[PDB]
Amino acid sequence: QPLNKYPVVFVHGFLGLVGDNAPALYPNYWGGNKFKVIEELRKQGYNVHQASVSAFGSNYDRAVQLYYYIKGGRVDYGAAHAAKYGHERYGKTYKGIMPNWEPGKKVHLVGHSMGGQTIRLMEEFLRNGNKEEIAYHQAHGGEISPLFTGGHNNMVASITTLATPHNGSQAADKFGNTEAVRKIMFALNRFMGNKYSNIDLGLTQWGFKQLPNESYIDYIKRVSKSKIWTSDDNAAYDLTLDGSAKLNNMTSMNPNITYTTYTGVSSHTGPLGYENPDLGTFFLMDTTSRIIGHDAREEWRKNDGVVPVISSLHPSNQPFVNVTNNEPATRRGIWQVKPILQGWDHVDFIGVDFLDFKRKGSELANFYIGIINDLLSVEATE
Amino acid sequence: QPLNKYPVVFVHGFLGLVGDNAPALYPNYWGGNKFKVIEELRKQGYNVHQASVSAFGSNYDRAVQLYYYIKGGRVDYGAAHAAKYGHERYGKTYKGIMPNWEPGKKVHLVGHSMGGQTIRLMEEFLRNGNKEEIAYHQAHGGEISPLFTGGHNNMVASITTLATPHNGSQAADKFGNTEAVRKIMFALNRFMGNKYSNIDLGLTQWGFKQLPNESYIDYIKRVSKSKIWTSDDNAAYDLTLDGSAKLNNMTSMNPNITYTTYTGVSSHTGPLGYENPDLGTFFLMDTTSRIIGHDAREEWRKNDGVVPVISSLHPSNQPFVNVTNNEPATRRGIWQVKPILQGWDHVDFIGVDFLDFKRKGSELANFYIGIINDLLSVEATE
Numbered sequence A, B: 001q002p003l004n005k006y007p008v009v010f011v012h013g014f015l016g017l018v019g020d021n022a023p024a025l026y027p028n029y030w031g032g033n034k035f036k037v038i039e040e041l042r043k044q045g046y047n048v049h050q051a052s053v054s055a056f057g058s059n060y061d062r063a064v065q066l067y068y069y070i071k072g073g074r075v076d077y078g079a080a081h082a083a084k085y086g087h088e089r090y091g092k093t094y095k096g097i098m099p100n101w102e103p104g105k106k107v108h109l110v111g112h113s114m115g116g117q118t119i120r121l122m123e124e125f126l127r128n129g130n131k132e133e134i135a136y137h138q139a140h141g142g143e144i145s146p147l148f149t150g151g152h153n154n155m156v157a158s159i160t161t162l163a164t165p166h167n168g169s170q171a172a173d174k175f176g177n178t179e180a181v182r183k184i185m186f187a188l189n190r191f192m193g194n195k196y197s198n199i200d201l202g203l204t205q206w207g208f209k210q211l212p213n214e215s216y217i218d219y220i221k222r223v224s225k226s227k228i229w230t231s232d233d234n235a236a237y238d239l240t241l242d243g244s245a246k247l248n249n250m251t252s253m254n255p256n257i258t259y260t261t262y263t264g265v266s267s268h269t270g271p272l273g274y275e276n277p278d279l280g281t282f283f284l285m286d287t288t289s290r291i292i293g294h295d296a297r298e299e300w301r302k303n304d305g306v307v308p309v310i311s312s313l314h315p316s317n318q319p320f321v322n323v324t325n326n327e328p329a330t331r332r333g334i335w336q337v338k339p340i341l342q343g344w345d346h347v348d349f350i351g352v353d354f355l356d357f358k359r360k361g362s363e364l365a366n367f368y369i370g371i372i373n374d375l376l377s378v379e380a381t382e
């Protein structure tokens, strides 16, 4: 007897590790020490979960993983996809949170940042399938994942995104996706693939798991042959303006789903009309904020630390409507864009900014309970 | 050659590590990344140095070390002192920054925080010697350090203190000096005495140095017999109200020395009249600020994070005069108390608050150059 008829699945963004897969010391992703989203919402009678998917992988890989996290089973990225990008077809295997998920039994999906993109792709696959996989299985036989078939409707009630870079971010184009920083990211992944590691950073399909009897030297040599080093099939690429536009171009509005976005601002206009980070922007986002805020295009400047406002409001090529705080958020098939949260940086959405005393736990509690109320109303107005 | 005729020696406080004795990653003590005090002042033609003395030891041990840091030589804490407290008489040996230091060759001394206390004790020793050591050498023969003899004047031109707890701090009484935290401090010292350690936290005279062939187990066993665990001859005790009052009671004014203090405030009055830390107080001082700011005695509440205003202005019951920022600070024999620096927490004085964007490098450069100007004034008005 949970208060919500459909399970709520929260989906972390880039870099996020949750649950058993978080290091020895590491912030609690959903709520920090400010408001324990999963535990508190459960205490209040809601059925909620935190998905665990690849921290460094592509929206594609993450979306497949999200599917298996919900459904249960062995991750299948698709034969065509695997062959085209050069990684394993099969990945980890998940218990499944709802082994009976199928048209009729729905789920609410809420994504922070990159999580918001991942959620869109996965629903796209359920509804319209994956044509390269359909064609490949046509040509060559074998099994095709039900995720890639198409024709699955009535499985997701709602898509809600928080500080999602629907239109990408310059912090990716000018930093995250540069050569030097991809190497840093991939080296970290190589290291955390070592044979004593208990944490999965989400690129093992690329070879980054040291065998028990393999020397580190041999490991280095083996994985430097991996295609990961030059591939676009990774998070860094997908977070770029181009990477995100590509996803926008292959997604579409499902008319039965309730769509809603939230966006934060944590910059202010300086005398030349550039944006600089507010005191209170989590300090690791200082430089990324400046890079965004000093864009040549004025409307690309205001930002939450790492995502510009124009990126987070809605996918630029998809229908939207500006909504008030008080309107029921119950319209289907159109991005309901919630009023910008002033002073909320990118990570204030998940409560991990331990340096920022203006953003209190009770505020964060209200924000999350507000999302649940909207979700309840989606249910009530079916 | 140098603009200043007398060398400036900067003396760090409690916990401070400088130069080669700082860990692989560690803040630059004098100026952070905001204004590199030693390097910049040298570039501008001033002769300046940063003393290196015990980070965890007593004002006594630190003051002896300061002497040898300047003069050069093997640290001699005194036979009477060693026997009374139960630690080695002899300590490290220093090259010496001014091997010819003697009456006639003077030095300017500037102390941050505890450094301000250490500087007072060392001048006390030069001028008046150390009675227990004089008596001990009377009774028993031996050599006595010239530091403990008394009669050495015309060696220090000036004493300037920044955020010095001249009257102690409740953050020591109610936290720093509790049993639980002395154990933490002493364990850290034991650990950093291990045979692979390249940093000296300043308590080796208590036995915290593992021998090359000693096992860690034997080391633990040996040093747990040390008197350090129950002694008052350590920084934690000296920083308490009582500990500091004892130093106050054995110091006296030198009529040739120019004395000046700076003090910061980084708390604000709440309802009820208690003080709480400003946003912008370096976050590690949050709790210590509250402890101070909630004192029963109202005049002990305003604080810089870890030292209350009333402790920093001047030693209580020593002569002082409130001074303006503009006028020459050129009086001898009396504590010239500079106007409180509004918004400056304890570590803003040394530029290491990397989270605090209100406290700019150019501001800190002005602050230091201001001190040098006063020091130049002292020289010019001899």
Ligand SMILES: CCCCCCCCCCC/C=C\CCCCC(=O)O
Pocket (backbone or CB within 6 Å): A012, A013, A014, A015, A016, A112, A113, A114, A115, A165, A169, A171, A172, A175, A176, A181, A185, A239, A306, A307, A347, A352
């Ligand atoms: C090391 C590279 C960082 C570069 C930043 C790239 C652009 C980021 C845009 C949006 C990020 C998406 C998910 C962010 C989740 C943040 C989670 C966390 O910090 O614990």
Ligand SMILES: CCCCCCCCCCC/C=C\CCCCC(=O)O
Pocket (backbone or CB within 6 Å): B013, B014, B015, B016, B017, B112, B113, B114, B115, B165, B169, B171, B172, B175, B176, B181, B185, B239, B288, B306, B307, B347, B352
């Ligand atoms: C670990 C125990 C902390 C207890 C705090 C006791 C009160 C201290 C008052 C004044 C201390 C002297 C100097 C502070 C120097 C700051 C050095 C640094 O931040 O690297």
Ligand SMILES: CCCCCCCCCCCC(=O)O
Pocket (backbone or CB within 6 Å): A187, A188, A190, A191
């Ligand atoms: C916080 C630790 C930073 C150390 C960076 C140096 C490591 C360079 C690359 C290492 C790659 C690997 O170990 O496989």
Ligand SMILES: CCCCCCCCCCCC(=O)O
Pocket (backbone or CB within 6 Å): B187, B188, B190, B191
């Ligand atoms: C980051 C701090 C790690 C805390 C570990 C606690 C260890 C207890 C005291 C150790 C004493 C010693 O090793 O000599």
Ligand SMILES: CCCCCCCC(=O)O
Pocket (backbone or CB within 6 Å): A015, A016, A017, A023, A055, A192, A201
């Ligand atoms: C020594 C442990 C290293 C943990 C790496 C943290 C992964 C991340 O930033 O997502």
Ligand SMILES: CCCCCCCC(=O)O
Pocket (backbone or CB within 6 Å): A215, A216
């Ligand atoms: C460098 C610290 C620990 C190294 C473990 C080596 C195990 C192995 O490779 O067989």
Ligand SMILES: CCCCCCCC(=O)O
Pocket (backbone or CB within 6 Å): B025, B026
């Ligand atoms: C831009 C600054 C980067 C420094 C990283 C390590 C921080 C530390 O060791 O305190």
Ligand SMILES: CCCCCCCC(=O)O
Pocket (backbone or CB within 6 Å): B215
């Ligand atoms: C895990 C400890 C690594 C070095 C220990 C020193 C060994 C020795 O005392 O011979």
Ligand SMILES: CCCCCC(=O)O
Pocket (backbone or CB within 6 Å): A023, A024, A025, A026, A027
């Ligand atoms: C963001 C913090 C990561 C540090 C991981 C660890 O030290 O176990």
Ligand SMILES: CCCCCC(=O)O
Pocket (backbone or CB within 6 Å): A194, A195, A196, A214, A215, A216
């Ligand atoms: C190959 C074994 C060495 C790697 C394990 C480690 O990094 O602790």
Ligand SMILES: CCCCCC(=O)O
Pocket (backbone or CB within 6 Å): A284, A285, A287
């Ligand atoms: C998102 C992490 C960025 C680190 C860049 C910096 O500290 O300037």
Ligand SMILES: CCCCCC(=O)O
Pocket (backbone or CB within 6 Å): B015, B016, B017, B023, B055, B192, B201
């Ligand atoms: C291994 C690092 C030791 C830190 C020394 C200090 O806190 O002053």
Ligand SMILES: [Ca+2]
Pocket (backbone or CB within 6 Å): A280, A281, A282, A343, A344, A345, A348, A353, A356, A359
């Ligand atoms: Ca913030």
Ligand SMILES: [Ca+2]
Pocket (backbone or CB within 6 Å): B280, B281, B282, B343, B344, B345, B348, B353, B356, B359
């Ligand atoms: Ca500060």
Ligand SMILES: [Cl-]
Pocket (backbone or CB within 6 Å): A101, A102, A103, A146, A152
């Ligand atoms: Cl299905």
Ligand SMILES: [Cl-]
Pocket (backbone or CB within 6 Å): A192, A193, A197, A198, A199, A200, A201, A204, A209
């Ligand atoms: Cl792993």
